[PDB]
């Protein structure tokens, strides 16, 4: 009767003692909403396994005989052969179907949970918040009794058909969703989100077309996308909980998730969140929905009668709670506390720290950091002869996330140290030099260019000594720099550099890039030309014209970091564009009737459009024909009705699903009944890749 009891759903005296707390957390509750959420989640994960987990592409990621560098959380973990991996994914699929239909629920939950986490821990390059969320939900649902309503196991066993469920089954889920919002809200209280730097180019999408009718683009890119997102993230968890504010909250959250689904390529995250949002509503909403339907429909939909007593709920008459109830309450408290604590657990595991905090995936800081890399140099010194060579930046790797984390860099360095000796190299020493900019700052080194990563010292619980600090002092420059970016022509381009004392940068301007110039914005630098071995000393506000086709070095010789810039124009591209414009002008003149004189023989193929019975076209002619063909193809693509696009989308997805199924079938046959002749394998692999049409 108390107002607080009505708003929060419980009275204070229920928390006075441990027994009353257990009774509150194990009170009867209706199971319908939990069952509906179970079905939706199972369906979404079943649709997700063939697409994002990578079963469609698994035959060229774990291929036998290929030498690749893996990034497992523990170095002990190693992938199995391909066939056993296909079997593991089959077990995942069976578990997901079991969860969807509610058949042998606990075994299904185990069969989905264990393989999912095995795959998740096997590769740190595939971590994202929407995968950690699926893992957590699978872990939670393994203990919740979601099969008491609308489940085949309900038909099989009468005692678990339309029965009561304890309240904590809901509570944890609700809490989880709240955390997923609220932590994000506090994570986005950063200087790079409240000021409009992150996701600055997301305001041009056509879905924000109506908003531009009332506000300018610059304000639309700060008020709506950034502040609106922060307010929704902070407030949605509280809005959905209270009865008065539930409707507006549901409407806003649904709109937010639909826009996220269309804007991004998150995948199934938005749909899962939409499925989870109604869970804050009353636990019996599907039943009242089923009641308000014609009797004919009710003959096929789930039951409408009241739930029966269960053995997994504490009923007041006084009943002494057993062991399931106490364990449930303790699990709820401990799990929620761990979920709150883990995102801020970065002060213990300092080894994984970087410019950002910890590995991505378990922090809930979604879409608050953009990185733009400029160059990556991998140098190696042979330990026997002393020769110095350079490797390709991304060799023996399948992701590009090793450029931003120290631990992954160490693993990659050890992998190279183990694989290179197959290429006539003795015990090598590897140095890395990586340029990266976060949220449009000066491009700076992330790893020290003089430290041997192979013999460097790294432990998870000690801070790394070879990660350059982020130069926050040059944060305000992001204003002024932007102006320079908008004061250039359609051809000139600019690249900014900020360098630490002592280090030097060696660059080789390509022969194409004539008219390359260097200007210094802050500090003292010295520029050395090695062709004649002459070094000059540049100070603030000085511009130099560097040679093209040779090497130049820049040294910083000040106590503080030095900030400078390169301004360059592609002269070859300019000449090609001018010549193409001249050719197009001549073509138009011939077409419109001007230039009555006979066309050059080289022009005749252009009018004909086909190189038949004549000399091969010049490179300029080939380029012009290619550009014209590309423009025609683009025009044809744009002038396409919606139904063709939808048909192509459906056909592509059908091909992906069919290839997944056939590859799994061949893998299972090979594992079980043995391997047929190599010609048969070739024929079946050819059949698998056949386009459906």
């Amino acid at each position: 009767d108390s107002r607080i009891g009505k708003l929060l759903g419980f009275e204070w005296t229920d928390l006075s003692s441990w027994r009353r707390l257990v009774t509150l957390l194990n009170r009867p509750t209706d199971p319908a909403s939990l069952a509906v959420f179970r079905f939706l989640f199972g369906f979404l994960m079943v649709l997700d396994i063939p697409q994002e987990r990578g079963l469609s592409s698994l035959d060229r990621k774990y291929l036998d005989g290929l030498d690749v560098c893996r990034f497992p959380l523990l170095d002990a973990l190693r992938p199995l052969p391909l066939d056993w991996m296909y079997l593991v994914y089959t077990i995942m699929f069976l578990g997901a179907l079991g969860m969807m239909l509610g058949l042998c629920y606990r075994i299904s939950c185990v069969l989905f949970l264990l393989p999912y986490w095995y795959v998740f821990l096997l590769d740190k390059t595939s971590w994202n918040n929407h995968s950690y969320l699926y893992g957590l939900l699978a872990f939670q649902l393994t203990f919740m009794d979601a099969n008491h309503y609308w489940s085949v196991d309900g038909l099989l066993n009468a005692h678990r058909r339309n029965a009561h469920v304890p309240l904590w089954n809901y509570a944890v889920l609700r809490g989880q969703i709240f955390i997923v919002y609220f932590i994000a809200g506090v994570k986005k209280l950063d200087a790079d989100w409240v000021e409009g730097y992150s996701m600055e180019y997301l305001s041009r999408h056509w879905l924000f077309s109506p908003f531009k009718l009332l506000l300018s683009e610059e304000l639309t890119s700060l008020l709506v996308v950034h502040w609106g997102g922060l307010l929704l993230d902070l407030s949605a968890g509280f809005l959905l909980f209270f009865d008065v504010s539930r409707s507006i909250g549901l409407f806003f959250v649904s709109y937010f998730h639909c826009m996220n689904s269309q804007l991004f390529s998150i995948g199934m995250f938005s749909y899962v969140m939409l499925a989870s949002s109604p869970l804050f509503c009353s636990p019996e909403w599907p039943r009242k929905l089923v009641s308000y339907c014609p009797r004919r429909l009710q003959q096929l939909l789930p039951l409408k009668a009241a739930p029966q007593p269960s053995v997994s709920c504490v009923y007041k008459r006084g009943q002494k709670p057993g062991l399931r109830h106490q364990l449930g309450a303790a699990f709820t408290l401990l799990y929620l506390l761990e979920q709150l604590f883990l995102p801020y657990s970065h002060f213990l595991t300092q080894g994984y720290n970087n410019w950002t905090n910890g590995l991505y995936g378990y922090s809930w800081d979604m879409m608050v950091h953009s990185r733009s890399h400029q160059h990556v140099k991998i140098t190696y010194r042979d330990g026997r002869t002393g020769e110095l060579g350079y490797l390709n930046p991304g060799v023996f790797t399948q992701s590009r996330r090793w450029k931003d984390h120290a631990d992954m860099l160490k693993q990659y360095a050890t992998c190279l140290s183990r694989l290179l000796p197959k290429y006539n190299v003795t015990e090598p020493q590897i140095y890395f030099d990586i340029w990266v900019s976060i949220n449009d700052r000066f491009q700076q080194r992330i790893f020290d260019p003089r430290v041997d990563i192979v013999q460097a010292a790294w432990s998870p619980f000690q801070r790394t000594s070879w990660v350059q600090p982020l130069l926050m002092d040059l944060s305000p420059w992001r204003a002024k720099l932007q102006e320079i970016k908008s004061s250039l022509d359609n051809h000139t381009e600019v690249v900014f550099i900020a360098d630490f004392p002592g280090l030097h940068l060696e660059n080789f301007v390509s022969e194409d890039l004539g008219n390359t110039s260097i200007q210094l914005l802050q500090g003292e630098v010295t520029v050395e030309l090695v062709a004649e071995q002459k070094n000059q000393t540049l100070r603030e506000g000085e511009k130099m014209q560097l040679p093209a086709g040779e090497y130049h070095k820049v040294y910083t010789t000040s106590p503080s970091p030095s900030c400078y810039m390169y301004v360059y124009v592609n002269t070859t591209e300019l000449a090609l564009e001018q010549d193409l414009a001249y050719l197009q002008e001549l073509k138009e003149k011939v077409e419109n009737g001007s230039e009555t004189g006979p066309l050059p023989p080289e022009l005749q193929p252009l009018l004909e459009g086909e190189v038949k019975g004549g000399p091969e076209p010049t490179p300029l002619v080939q380029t012009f024909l290619r550009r014209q063909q590309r423009l025609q193809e683009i025009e044809r693509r744009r002038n396409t009705p919606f139904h063709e696009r939808f048909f192509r989308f459906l056909l592509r997805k059908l091909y992906v699903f069919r290839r997944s199924f056939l590859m799994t079938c061949i893998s299972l046959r090979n594992l079980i009944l043995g391997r047929p002749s190599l010609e048969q394998l070739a024929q079946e692999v050819t059949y698998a890749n056949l386009r459906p049409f």
Binding site: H375, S399, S510, Y551
Partner: protein, 33 residues
Amino acid sequence: TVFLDHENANKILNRPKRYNSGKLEEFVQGNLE
């Protein structure tokens, strides 16, 4: 492909590969990245 020449190793001003430039971590690129 497993080794790069000295001349081509150091091209800072060369146009960065515009393959998912300015990409946020939370994305399923697909097609082997």
